[PDB]
Every structure is written in C-alpha cells, then in structure tokens.
Amino acid sequence: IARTFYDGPEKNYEKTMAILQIEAEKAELRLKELEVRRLMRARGDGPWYQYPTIDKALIDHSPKTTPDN
Amino acid sequence: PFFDVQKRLGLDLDRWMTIQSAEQPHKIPGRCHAFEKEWIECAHGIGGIRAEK
Amino acid sequence: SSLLDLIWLETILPKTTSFIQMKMSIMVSNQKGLIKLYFLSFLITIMISMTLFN
Amino acid sequence: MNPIIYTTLIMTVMSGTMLVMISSHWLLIWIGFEMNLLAMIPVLMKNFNPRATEAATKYFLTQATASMMLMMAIIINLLYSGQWTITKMFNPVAMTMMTMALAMKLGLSPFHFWVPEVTQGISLQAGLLLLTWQKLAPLSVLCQISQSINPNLMLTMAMLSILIGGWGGLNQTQLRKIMAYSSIAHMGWMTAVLPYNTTMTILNLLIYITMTLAMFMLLIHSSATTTLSLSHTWNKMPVITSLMMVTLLSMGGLPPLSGFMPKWMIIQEMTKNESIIMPTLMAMTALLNLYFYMRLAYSSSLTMFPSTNNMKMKWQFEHTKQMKLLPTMIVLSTLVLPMTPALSSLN
Amino acid sequence: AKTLLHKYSDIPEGTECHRKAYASTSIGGATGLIVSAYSIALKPPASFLEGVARTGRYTFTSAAIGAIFGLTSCISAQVREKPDDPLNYFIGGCAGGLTLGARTRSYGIGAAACAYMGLTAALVKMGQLEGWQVFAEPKV
Amino acid sequence: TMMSGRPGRVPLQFLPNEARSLPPPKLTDPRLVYMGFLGYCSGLIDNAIRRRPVVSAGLHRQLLYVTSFVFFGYYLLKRQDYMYALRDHDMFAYVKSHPEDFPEKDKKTYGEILEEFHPVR
Amino acid sequence: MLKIIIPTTMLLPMTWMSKHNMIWINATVHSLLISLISLSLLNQLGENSLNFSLTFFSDSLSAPLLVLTTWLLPLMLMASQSHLSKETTTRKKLYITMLILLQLFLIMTFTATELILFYILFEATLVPTLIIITRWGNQTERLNAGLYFLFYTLAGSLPLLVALVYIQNTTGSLNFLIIHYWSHPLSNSWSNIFMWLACIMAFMVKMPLYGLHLWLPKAHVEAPIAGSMVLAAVLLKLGGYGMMRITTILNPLTNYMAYPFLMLSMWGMIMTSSICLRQTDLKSLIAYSSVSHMALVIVAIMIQTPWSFMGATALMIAHGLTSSMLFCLANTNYERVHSRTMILARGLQTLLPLMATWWLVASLTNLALPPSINLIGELFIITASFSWSNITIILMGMNMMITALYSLYMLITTQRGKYTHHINNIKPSFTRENALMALHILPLLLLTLNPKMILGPLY
Amino acid sequence: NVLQIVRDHWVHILVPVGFVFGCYLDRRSDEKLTAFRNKSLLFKRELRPNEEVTWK
Amino acid sequence: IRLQEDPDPEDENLYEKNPDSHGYDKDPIVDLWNMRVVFFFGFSIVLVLGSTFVAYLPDYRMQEWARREAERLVKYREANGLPLMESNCFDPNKIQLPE
Ligand SMILES: CCCCCCCCCCCCCCCCCC(=O)OC[C@H](COP(=O)([O-])OCC(O)COP(=O)([O-])OC[C@@H](COC(=O)CCCCCCCCCCCCCCCCC)OC(=O)CCCCCCCCCCCCCCCCC)OC(=O)CCCCCCCCCCCCCCCCC
Ligand SMILES: CCCCCCCCCCCCCCCCC[C@@H](O)O[C@H](CO[C@H](O)CCCCCCCCCCCCCCC)COP(=O)(O)OCC[N+](C)(C)C
Secondary structure (H helix, E strand, C coil): CHHHHCCCHHHHHHHHHHHHHHHHHHHHHHHHHHHHHHHHHHHCCCCCCCCCCCCHHHCCCCCCCCCCC | CCCCHHHHHCCCCCHHHHCCCCCCHHHCCCCCHHHHHHHHHHHCCCHHHHHHC | CHHHHHHHHHHHHHHHHHHHHHHHHHHHHCCCCCHHHHHHHHHHHHHHHHHHCC | CCHHHHHHHHHHHHHHHHHHHHCCEHHHHHHHHHHHHHHHHHHHCCCCCHHHHHHHHHHHHHHHHHHHHHHHHHHHHHHHHCCCECCCCCCHHHHHHHHHHHHHHHCCCCCCCHHHHHHHHCCHHHHHHHHHHHHHHHHHHHHHCHHHCCHHHHHHHHHHHHHHHHHHHHHCCEHHHHHHHHHHHHHHHHHHHCCCCHHHHHHHHHHHHHHHHHHHHHHHHHCCCEHHHHCCHHHCCHHHHHHHHHHHHHHCCCCCCCCHHHHHHHHHHHHHCCCCHHHHHHHHHHHHHHHHHHHHHHHHCCCCCCCCCCHHHHHHCCCCCCCCCHHHHHHHCCCCHHHHHHHHHHC | CHHHHHHHHHCCCCCCHHHHHHHHHHHHHHHHHHHHHHHHHHCCCCCHHHHHHHHHHHHHHHHHHHHHHHHHHHHHHHHHCCCCCHHHHHHHHHHHHHHHHHHHCCHHHHHHHHHHHHHHHHHHHHHHHHCCCCCCCCCC | CCCCCCCCCCCCCCCCCHHHHCCCCCCCCHHHHHHHHHHHHHHHHHHHHCCCCCCCCCHHHHHHHHHHHHHHHHHHHHHHHHHHHHHHHHHHHHHHHCCCCCCCCCCCCCCCCCCCCCCCC | CHHHHHHHHHHHHHHHHCCCCCHHHHHHHHHHHHHHHHHHHHCCCCCCCEECCCCEEECCCHHHHHHHHHHHHHHHHHHHHHHCCCCCHHHHHHHHHHHHHHHHHHHHHHHECEHHHHHHHHHHCHHHHHHHHHHHCCCCCHHHHHHHHHHHHHHHHHHHHHHHHHHHHHHCCCEHHHHHHCCCCCCCCHHHHHHHHHHHHHHHHHCCCCCCCCHHHHHHHHCCHHHHHHHHHHHCHHHHHHHHHHCCCCCCCHHHHCHHHHHHHHHHHHHHHHHHHCCCEHHHHHHHHHHHHHHHHHHHHHHCCHHHHHHHHHHHHHHHHHHHHHHHHHHHHHHHHCCCECCCCCCHHHHCHHHHHHHHHHHHHHCCCCCCHHHHHHHHHHHHHHHHCCCHHHHHHHHHHHHHHHHHHHHHHHHCCCCCCCCCCCCCCCHHHHHHHHHHHHHHHHHHHCHHHHCCCCC | CHHHHHHHHHHHHHHHHHHHHHHHHHHHHHCCCCCCCCCCCCCCCCCCCCCCCCCC | CCCCCCCCCCCCCHHHHCCCCCCCCCCHHHHHHHHHHHHHHHHHHHHHHHHHHHHCCCCCCCHHHHHHHHHHHHHHHHHCCCCCCCCCCCCCCCCCCCC
C-alpha cells in the first residue's frame, strides 16, 4: 500500500516548509503594505494619494494692461 | 469618475476658464493675479496634501 | 418543551426582533406620498445638517 | 413619441452624464446635470398616464432643488477660493451644501421618498434607466470630491439609507417599489464605503448595476409588475423564475454569489480603517433585504401559485423580442466571485 | 449636539450627579425635539394644539429618559465607588428603558427597552473605555 | 483614491507601455479557463431563455460567447497583474526611501523571549 | 484534494447528460466510487497534517468528516430516489445537482486551509440546503423552517466575517498553519471578549447551542429525507470543526469565557433529553436527541483538553451515522402511513421484523452501548469533564439515564405493542430500504472495531 | 446496437477522467513547492549516483 | 370549490405490477440492475475493500517507531544510571532567564 499509493515523509515535510515560507512572506508583505498606505495617506510624499493640484502651465505671463499684474 | 478626455486628446474645453490667471481677452489682469500665480506655482506637482501643508 | 422551547426561547430572540422589524417597516412605508410633507422633511434635514454637523 | 426623438433623448441623457464625468469645471458639471434632467423628464413621461406625469413632476422638483443647492455650493466655494476646478472644496459650508445636493440627487436618506414614488410611477424601462444612469453620475462627482467629504455626515446618511431601504422593502408588495428600496440600501452601502475607498465604491456600483439590469430585464421579460403577476410566471416559462431566484439570492449577499463580493470588500476596507461597529451594523441590517428577497423568491420559483385558464393560449404563443445581454448580465451577477482581484484592474 | 456631548463628557463620571442629570436631560430633550419635528413634518397634526401636545409628549418622554439614565448611572457609580465600570451604564440604560415603558404604558415595551438600552449603554461605556470609534477617521 | 493621480499616468489608458515588461498571463491560465466557463454558461443560459436545445443548439453562438469572454479576460488579467505589480513597486520604493519609518529590529530567540504560560485545567 | 474535488464537478455533467431512467444508478455508482477514493485520506501522519497545496490540507480531524460526507451522498441518493418517483426528469436532475453541490462545498470546507475561504464555503453550504428544504419539503412549514435556519446561521456568521477580516488586518494572515505557529495570548479586554464572542457565537449557532436551536427542529422536521440526513450528519459538524480550529487563537480567554456556554450546554442537554421524553413527533425526537449530543460535543470543545477533543471527534462521527440511520427509519415509516405521529403506527415488529431489528440496532447505538464509538466519545467527554469538575459526572449520568429512557421509549412505542387495526397498507420492507439500513449500520461497527481512525489529531 | 450503447454509456468515463485529471493537477501543484526539496535539516542527504531529485 | 384542482392521487404500490421488486425503479430491468450495482459496489467494493485497506494502512503515525525509540531510550538510560524521563524538555543553559 505504501509503495503503490503513498510517498515518503520527506515530500510532505519539505512541501510544508515551502508553504510556510510563502504564507509567512505574504503576511509580512500585507503588514508592510498597510504601514506604507498609512504613511503615504498621512504625508502625501509618495506616489499614492496624490490628489490633483492646478497646473501652472495655464498661467499667462505676458505683460498685462496694468504694470502691477 | 473623472475621465480626463481633455488631457488625453490635448483638448481645451474648460481649463481656459478654470483659473483667473490664464489667458484673458485684451490681457486684462485679474484682481489677485499675482497671488494666484504664486500659489499655483508653489502647489504645482506636489499634490493636495503637500499643497495644503 | 412548552414554557421554554415553544414560548420563551421563541419570544426572546426571533419573535421580538421580527415584531420590531415589522413595526419599523410599517412606520417607514406608511407615507401618503405628499411632496409637501417630505419637502418639509427635506428642510428639517438641511437645517439639522447645517447646524449640528461641523 | 417618435423613435428618433426617443433615441435622441437617450443620447442627450448620456451626453449630460458624460459631460459631468469628463468636465473639470464646476459650471460644466452643473450644465451636464441640467442637460441630464432636461432630457430625462420626457423619458419618464414616455408612456403617458397620470401616474407617469406625477412621477415626472416629483422627479423634476427634487432634481431642480438639488441643482439649485449644488450651484449655491459652487458659488460659495468660488467666493472663498476663486477656483472653478473640481477638487477638494475650500469651504466646509459649501462642501456640506454639495454633499446634501448630491445625496438628494442619489436618493440617500432622508432624501429617499421620491425614489420609490417615481419608480412605482414610471414603467420598467424608465425605472431601469433611472436607477442605473442617475446613480452613475452623482457618484462620479462624489468620488472626485471624496477627500473633502465629512465622514460623519456621509456615514450617517449611508446608514440611514441602509436601514430605510431594508424596512421599506420589507413592507412593499410592488416590484418597482421593492427595486427602489433595494436601490436605496445599495446606495447606502456605496456611500458608506465612499469616504475610504472610491475603488470599492466603483466596484459596488458595477456589481449593483449588473444585478439591477438582470433583475429589471427579467421583470420586463415576464411582464410582471406585482408579486401576484410574477406568481404566474412559473406556469409559462419556469426558466426565468429560476434565473430570477438565483439573481435574488445574489442580490441578498449570499456566498458564493457575486453580491457577496461588494459587501465583503467594503467590510474589509472599513475594518482596515479601524471601523468595526459600522461594518457590523451594516452587515446585520442587510438581513432585511435578504428577507424580502427570499419572500419574493418563495412566491415566484420555490412554490407554485395558482394560475388561470388563458395561460394555455399564452403557452401556445412564444416570446418575440429578444433581451440584449440578458444571459451575460445573469451570469455576471451570480458567478464572478472567483474573479474578485480584478478590482485592481478597476483601480 | 457636539457641545452638549462635550459638556456631558467633561462632567466627571462619578461626581456632580445633578450636573450629569441636567446634561443628560438636555441631550434627551434635544433628541426629542428633533424626533417631534420630523414627526410633525411627516405626519402632520390635525391642529396646532394637537401638534404642540405631540411635541410636548415626545420631548418630555425623551427628557425623562435622559434624566433617569443620568441620575441612575451617576448615583450607581458614586455609591459603588467604581467609575469606569460598564455595569453602571447598564443600570442607567435599563432605568431609561423602564421609564420609556412607564411613559408608553406597556410592560413589554418597558422590558424590551430595559434590555436593549442597557446593552447599548454598556456598549457605549465599553467604547469610551477602549477607544472604539463609530465614525472612524479615514487612514490606510 | 490611492493610485489615481500617480505620476506619469496617461489618462484613459487600459495598458501603458511599462506593462510590457511583465510576464503575460499564460493561455492555459486557470483564470482564463474560468472566464471561458463563464462564457459557456452565458451561452447555455441564452439557449435556455430562447427555448432552444440548451446543449446542442447554437454552436456558433456558444463558441462566440466563449471566445469573447476569453479575449476580454486575457486583457483584464493583464491589467490586473500590471496594477498589482505597480502597487508592489511603489510599496518597496517607499520602504527603501523611508528607513527611519521602516527600521530593522534585532531578532531575539525564544530562549531569550519570556512568554507567560497559561495552564489549561 | 483535486483527485476528489474534480470527480464531483464531473458528477454534475454526468447527471445532466445521463438518460432519464439511469440518473439514480449512475449517481449512486460514481458516488460510491468517489467515497472509496476518499478513503485514502485516512492515512495520516503523527506529527503534522497532509499539506497538499497552498489552498487545501487534510488532518486527522478533516479526514473522517470527508469520508463521512462522501459516504453519506449515495445514501441520500437512495432515499431521494425512494421519495421522488413521480418527479420530472429535470427536477430529479436539479435535486441531484443540489446534493452534488452540497457535497462539493462540504469537501472544500473541510479541506480549506484559510479561515476566510473556510468561511466562504461553509456559508455557501446554506444555499443548496435552503433550496432543498423550501422546494422539496412536504408541508407548509418548510418556508418558515428555511427562514429560521437561514437567519439564525447568518446572524451568527456575519460577526465572524468581521472578526476574520479584522484578524487578517491585525496579524497579516488567516492561514491556519501561520496562525497556529504565530499565535499570541489573548489579553482580558472588552475588544478581545467581543472578538471571542463573534467567532464562538457563529460556530455555536452552527452547533447549535441550547437557546439557539429552534431552527434545528424546524428545519430537520420539515426538510425532505436527504435534507434531514445531511443536516444532522454533516452540517452540524461544521460548528464543531470550526470551534476546534479557531480556539487556537482564543487562549487564554477560553478559560473565563466558556462558563456560560458550558452551563447552557449541560443544562440544555438535560432539558432536550427531557423534551425527547415527551415528543409526539418522531422526527422532532430525533432532532432533539441530535441537539443533546451536540451539546455534549460543545462541552468537550469548551473544556478543551486532549481527551475531550478525541471524544468530540468520535461522538461527532458516531452521531452523524446514528442520526442519519434514525431519520431513514422514520422516513420509511412515514412513507408507509403518510404521517409523522409516533403513536399512529404500532406493532411494526410483528408487521416488519427486519425493520424492527434495524430499529433495535439504531436505538442501541443512539444510547452509549459499549464498545460502540458513541460510547467511546461520550465516555472520553465524561472523563474530561470529570477532570474539569466533579459534578459534571452528576449531569452526565442524568443525561445518560434520560437518553436510554427516551431511546427505548421510541423503540417500544413504534415497534412493540399491537398493530393499528385500520392501517392495512404496510407493504413488506423493500430491498432498497434494507440495504440503506445495512449501509448505515455496518460502517459504525467497523469503526468500533478500529477506533483510532476517528479520534482526531490529539490521538 | 453497439452505437447506442456508446451513445448512452459514454457518461461513465466522466468521473474516472476527472479523477485522472485531479491526480495530474495534484502532481502539478506539488511540483511548484520544491523549494526546500532535500534542504530540510532533518532529511538533508547526498544524492544517489543515479538520481536527480529526492522526491517528485 | 375555489379552484379547478386535481384530486389527490392514490398511493402507488411497486409490488402490484412487479411482485419481485427491489423498490428502486418501476421498470423491472432498471430496478434489478439498480439493486445489483448498489449491492455490488457499496457492500463488496466499498465495505470489504475499504475495510481491508484501512486495516492494512501503513503505520504512518509512527506508533511502533515511537515504541522502539522508547525501548532504546529506556535501555540506554537504565544501563547508565540516568533518569528514565528527563526533568526538562529543553536545555537550561540554552534558556536565558531575565534578571
Ligand atoms: C451542470 C452543472 C452546473 C453547476 C452550476 C454551474 C453554473 C450554472 C451552469 C450554467 C447554466 C446552465 C444552463 C441553465 C439552464 C438549464 C435549462 C435546462 O433545462 O437544462 C437542461 C439541459 C438539457 O435539457 P434540454 O433538452 O436542453 O431542455 C430541456 C428543458 O430545458 C426543460 O426545461 P423546463 O421547461 O422543464 O424548465 C423547468 C425548470 C427549469 O430549471 C432550470 O432551467 C434550472 C437551471 C437554471 C437555474 C439557474 C442555473 C444557474 C445559473 C447561475 C447561478 C449560479 C449557479 C451556481 C449556484 C451555486 C449555489 C446553489 O424549472 C424547474 O424545474 C423549477 C423547479 C426548481 C426551482 C428551484 C431550484 C433552482 C436551482 C437554481 C440553482 C441551480 C444551480 C445549478 C444549475 C445547473 C443547470 C444545468 O441540460 C443542461 O443544460 C445541462 C448543463 C450543461 C451540460 C453540458 C455538458 C457538455 C458535455 C460534457 C462536458 C464534460 C466536462 C467538460 C470537460 C472535459 C471532459 C472530458
Ligand atoms: C497609440 C495608438 C494605440 C493606442 C491604444 C489605445 C490606448 C488605450 C485606449 C483605451 C480605450 C479608449 C478610451 C475609452 C474609455 C477608456 C476606459 C478605460 O480604458 O480606462 C481605464 C479604466 O479601465 C477600467 O476601469 C477597467 C475595467 C475593469 C472591468 C471589470 C472591473 C472589475 C470587477 C471585479 C470582478 C470581475 C468579474 C469578471 C469580469 C468579467 C483607465 O482610465 P482612467 O483615466 O485612469 O479612469 C479614471 C477613473 N478612475 C481613476 C477612478 C479609474
């Protein structure tokens, strides 16, 4: 029965090790992503939560009717 | 929500009217043209949060 | 069987909740469809939002 | 109404909504709202009768008041900032006015009565278009101006919408009023998630639109506008009743159907922001919506109501008009839970 | 409403029971006034006197519930010398529920209100102690 | 809005040029197979509603259903993968550029860590 | 796990593409084959679980439940083919499809490695069950029974969803292996109390706990025979499996929060046995006996010792088999006389001898008769409860006495005495019914022969 | 005739081929978790002269 | 009457048409083959083969392995005068208590 239907314990042992590594790395990444999202939303110094401001290319710098702008 | 067709196609449909420091007829200046220009040039490219801070 | 299972375990959790939901449903849905009434409601809501929310 | 006039009015409604969704100017957004309402009134009054006229009158009054408040908010914002671009609003008073105006346009409580009234008043096609598109536009404006939304006011109106939709749908027997209260509850859920994740707002909008389209098209196929009229559909075309049953189960948020995905994602997102009481209350309150969905399912597919004698002639005859994208809407509203991570594509 | 809640919270938990009762009465009266305004708007009275009577009834019911809640909770905490204990808020909530039942002349309403209001007030106290927030500020 | 307004974002672009550097989804992707299954279910429901033989009728129509679903699913999967890769890129960049906000911590063994013991009795 | 999952998703098209008269034969044959295939999961390790992939894993707790589900499907098919003779081909295929979907969801539930996927699947199990009950129930009360069942389960389970997403946000993962290895103590706080409450209350409603159990008589009495079989045998075991899984992260708060649930379980075990003593409906008697047994299982899980968990697992398996057999016997009686009243049909021993033998064996297994696995589980739970405290022995003895009393009361009422004179349509027992009883009873005795297969990971 | 038997009894291969496909997919899933194969401290060893991997 | 309703049909007996009925199907051949497949597969295949398979399942729980290891440890510890059961699971030298 063991020869025909089942494998050795090394396969299950090492597959379990690989699964544990993957899941632990995923948990670490999730926590780090939450921290990054919090910091980015609080500070606005990253690529996230960059709400639009007014483009400065719309400003007309040509001389006006009045000298003092 | 906001499909920026104007930015994508290079069209200008209301950006000419959005602000008072833009191109005005006969180069008539706004009341606060200098202040709006200064604020816009300060806040350009840094986002809303940093612009307000 | 009767006093606990068929009466009070039914009265506490499932029956009272269903009765409350039915009463609230009747209260919400019992409207005469009058624009004067619910526009007065709109005015009250606007005043409350303006004053009590800051 | 001439078919050319009807299609040009539909094109004008869509043009108003698209103008709202593409404009960067508050005046142009208001223009889009006005054009949408102007072309939408005759669509409501297409099949002329006193009920349709009254529904159109109530809709016009509500939308006109909302537009007046919206333009007042725009002007007040301009006064304190001199800005016409749609961004974070610079005045809290103007932001409150804009929030109330957009909530009134959407139908969020306590601005909801017109939704069941008009939906009952107008036909099935008009109700479908109304719900879907007229929720599509103001939600776009709110998503654009989300970062200045007052969380207290938005969440208050959202929770009120959820509760009121649940209770009203509990009481109603008319299918159009049931759909209207369902719309109120779903709008409540969406605006509840709005101040945190506009992506989740859009996801809930898409799933709600798919389910609503499927349900309305099934009702049009069966030509049933009441519970008892729908109770006769099992004796003519039993497939439509089964599809309606699974769609109703999905709309109630039962796993593993498509309706569970928006609730699940919204609860997760609100939990990420240290909100527990609000997600728990919202999850518990939806059981009212599930109850009246289940009551509707009992009458139509899970039981056999008595029928009549001319149903034999109805058997002899066959449905002519073909609904467009009905199978796609039925599949998308029940079997897209495994495809949840596409919300990143939606981002 | 925020000012009234701030006054009530600024009054210390186990002391100044008369001031606690007054603040809770004010909060209850404001709630009753709002409820009466919505009731008059949605279900119009048959006459001005009937409308005033309905407003007075609702406002007095709410104010009595608030006064009983505040008195019971503050006095219980004071005599037990255990501030920051949800049991005091539970007792106050059940007292308010019993007051509502007496006002509405219904033993069943009184019992259900005692249970639900006691649980709600205990949860409010637990939230105050633990930092729970209903309208949480956006983050993450 | 987290990734709306990201620098360098071209509006109305389903798939930018920088997405070409990511591995495209395989044609035997389980998600693509599920999209094809959704298309097949849509075809079966269409036959059922139109009262044709559900499994036999409209083979061309069912094939078009499956093909359209697979096509849109492939492009949707490409966009989803691009967005998740972009999220990871931004997160790693922020973590690297804010070391004082993300500091390394000394790793202690459980022989040094003291954990309270709670007997089950 | 795919070697078992895919054959069910292939049972579906086989059912829908088979001929009109061959659906039952094909479904039964291939369900038995799938059960035989799933028998290979019992070869478990002494150190850890069988981690097939990132999504599915099997343990000494999951394996017997999966084997029980796969074995239960063909018996449900036999009973359904008994009571659905005049149905149309499409509706027969729809009923078989509901059973197949339920089995698939149960398999994926028992093998799910994450708590959120487990939640999704164990909530997905509600839809086929609700459809089956409210569609193929015989009486009017099926609608109310379905409403009660659905709303009890969902009002229990929604706070569990909120707690699960909160735990994922706090700890980074809902994977069971990670949460077991990275578990930290739960401090005595209101927030932790309410998290514990959310999880435990969801699974208690699923159990059901005493005071949260009316939906169980409602649904079990009014569901069709296959629905009654699946509700008692497997669907009640989702709560116990979940409690044995979640309690990893709920310590040491389980020492202090378990008192009300232990008191409810013990006293309601006594009360439901007493209710069984005075039931005028046979299905209701079986349902309340199920409630008492699951209350004992709750006591075991709450006291939470290695001796209690083994007893809990053994009692769950034994109760599943015994309750399924009792429901089948009562359903045969109902199909005879078209009424569920216990005192309507009497003298059934002199009218149907071998069915009287099946009733006797089922009743002897229902009460803890040594060396049956029912008694093994009950005795392990009683010993663990004795170590917990020394008046639990008083409560357990009272419960055992009442259990024997009502079991033998049911046996004597239905089988002994003199037959009802005017009931003259009791045809001889069918080969199908006899085979159903034999397939219910023989595996229980073989499990008695080999008991370490159902004692769980704590063995 | 023979055609009718195949026309009717062709559904009896669906479950067996599903079992075969499930075994194949189980092998495919297992072959993606080979990152610690012959790397655990407990089962690490030197390969035999005529083998490439410890398990599959 | 309030409806045009069918009368409740009489109960159908399978033994009337087919005296040697197994209770599976109305059709005699289908019923016989249903009985045959149920009995063969269930009883023979599942019961007998699964029971012997479970009986001869390999000792993957390492019960006998643990017993042999225990025998070796007991022999070694009683030969050298060491305690049969060690006082601590881990090494106190490798454990570092707080001050
Ligand atoms: C196959 C498993 C599917 C599992 C779920 C997957 C997702 C859904 C499937 C997609 C949609 C399928 C079509 C739906 C309509 C079907 C209509 C019908 O009669 O169908 C019979 C039709 C044959 O009959 P026909 O001669 O064409 O026409 C007879 C009339 O239709 C006769 O019509 P009638 O006039 O007698 O109609 C009356 C009947 C009408 O009833 C129906 O039409 C029932 C079906 C429609 C209801 C909704 C279906 C699901 C839609 C999505 C919603 C979520 C689904 C998942 C839910 C999970 C939680 C429950 O109504 C009633 O009996 C009322 C009482 C029952 C109501 C309460 C129960 C409702 C249950 C709702 C949920 C059902 C879920 C499973 C559905 C499976 C359907 C086949 O057979 C099929 O459609 C079988 C399915 C397709 C098989 C393809 C096989 C291909 C070759 C083998 C491939 C092997 C694998 C490939 C790999 C390589 C291997 C080597
Ligand atoms: C140079 C010559 C070649 C040019 C090539 C063309 C370049 C692209 C052209 C795109 C089409 C032209 C414009 C037509 C409208 C554009 C629509 C789309 O392309 O835009 C994208 C939008 O893409 C869609 O959002 C993704 C559609 C995803 C559909 C599924 C949603 C996920 C549902 C979850 C469950 C899935 C179930 C399975 C579904 C079948 C991003 O545009 P963006 O300006 O940034 O949007 C702003 C609003 N935001 C920021 C809030 C988003």
